[PDB]
């Protein structure tokens, strides 16, 4: 994985150039947003189960998905989806802290479409649940940091769809 | 294949319910972006060979691949690589016009990774070549429609990996 600091360093290293004015300004922008990222992560950490609770309630609960015939019927498959969204929120927080979506591609989205197709997991229903996370996280954390989290949650959605 | 209109119809059809206001807003969003999509398609269609020209020059030319021993040494291989990027650009415009990545998962990606593995074609290089297309397409058309084109070109990159 690489964060925003490493991404600037790698790009400068590939060129074989010292950290120039453009590179320094990219770092300064991250250090300015660093206080916003840490505080946001602490809010998500405290209300980790709470976000997933109100995400399933909005989108998934009291639908054909929960009812027999649906994918998220059994307690085994329910706890699986809870865990999935717990994983999705946590990895979105990692990418939010890092300032790069490199961790999402490496550890989450690497053959996630092929996995979900084989099991028979609905893509549209999962996307809606991550969309439900986004709205819950934005209402909890704030406007600017909620937007920041919303980018990487869209990045999970785009890689899944 | 499915377009953005057919996708929201099929989602309502599978549930067996009439198109509601929330599903109607998905259509209205497409009918708002439709003028932007048609205009974008006209620009890329005009500079179809021209977009590839710059993309190969930015990424592929004067590298390992074109040099003897590489996968783009012979003229037959080189012409096939142009043909492949001509394919990728043409189908990305189809998916842009449709407003759904259904055609890409049908005619572009579904049985492409297996062929590229078997022929000995480097996927890591061709992804960078599509990323080279993405940068040329966005610069030619615009930031609004180039982002739209970007998603479907990224979709091909995700399917290849």
């Amino acid at each position: 994985m690489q964060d925003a600091i490493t991404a600037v360093i790698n790009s400068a290293d590939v060129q074989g150039k010292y950290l120039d004015g453009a590179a320094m300004d990219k770092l300064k922008s991250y250090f300015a947003s660093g206080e916003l990222r840490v505080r946001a992560a602490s809010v998500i950490s405290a209300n980790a189960a709470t976000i997933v609770k109100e995400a399933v309630a909005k989108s998934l609960l009291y639908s054909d998905v929960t009812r027999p015939g649906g994918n998220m019927y059994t307690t085994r498959r329910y706890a699986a989806c809870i865990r999935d969204l717990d994983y999705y929120l946590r990895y979105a927080t990692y990418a939010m802290l890092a300032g790069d979506a490199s961790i999402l591609d490496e550890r989450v989205l690497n053959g996630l479409k092929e996995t979900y197709n084989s099991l028979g997991v609905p893509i549209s229903s999962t996307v809606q649940a991550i969309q439900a996370i986004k709205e819950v996280t934005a209402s909890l954390v704030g406007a600017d940091a909620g937007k920041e989290m919303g980018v990487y949650l869209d990045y999970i959605c785009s890689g899944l769809s | 294949m499915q377009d953005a209109i057919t996708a929201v119809i099929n989602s309502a059809d599978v549930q067996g319910k009439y198109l509601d206001g929330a599903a109607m807003d998905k259509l209205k969003s497409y009918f708002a972006s439709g003028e932007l999509r048609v205009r974008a398609a006209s620009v890329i269609s005009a500079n179809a060979a021209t977009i590839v020209k710059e993309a190969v020059a930015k990424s592929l030319l004067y590298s390992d691949v074109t040099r003897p021993g590489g996968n783009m040494y012979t003229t037959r291989r080189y012409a096939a690589c142009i043909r492949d990027l001509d394919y990728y650009l043409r189908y990305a415009t189809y998916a842009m016009l449709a407003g759904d990545a259904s055609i890409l998962d049908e005619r572009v990606l579904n049985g492409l990774k297996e062929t590229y593995n078997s022929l000995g074609v480097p996927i890591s290089s061709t992804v960078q070549a599509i990323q080279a297309i993405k940068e040329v397409t966005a610069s030619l058309v615009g930031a609004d429609a180039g982002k739209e084109m970007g998603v479907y070109l990224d979709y091909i990159c995700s399917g290849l990996s």
């Binding site: 979506a101 591609d105 | 590298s63 390992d64 890591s124 061709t126 992804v127 960078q128 080279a132």
Partner: peptide, 20 residues
């Protein structure tokens, strides 16, 4: 994402032109 610029791509050193 995660893919580096120097995996399967020719890297040109972006230098400021001599007229600049």
């Amino acid at each position: 994402g995660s893919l580096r610029e120097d995996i399967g791509q020719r890297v040109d050193k972006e230098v400021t032109p001599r007229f600049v």
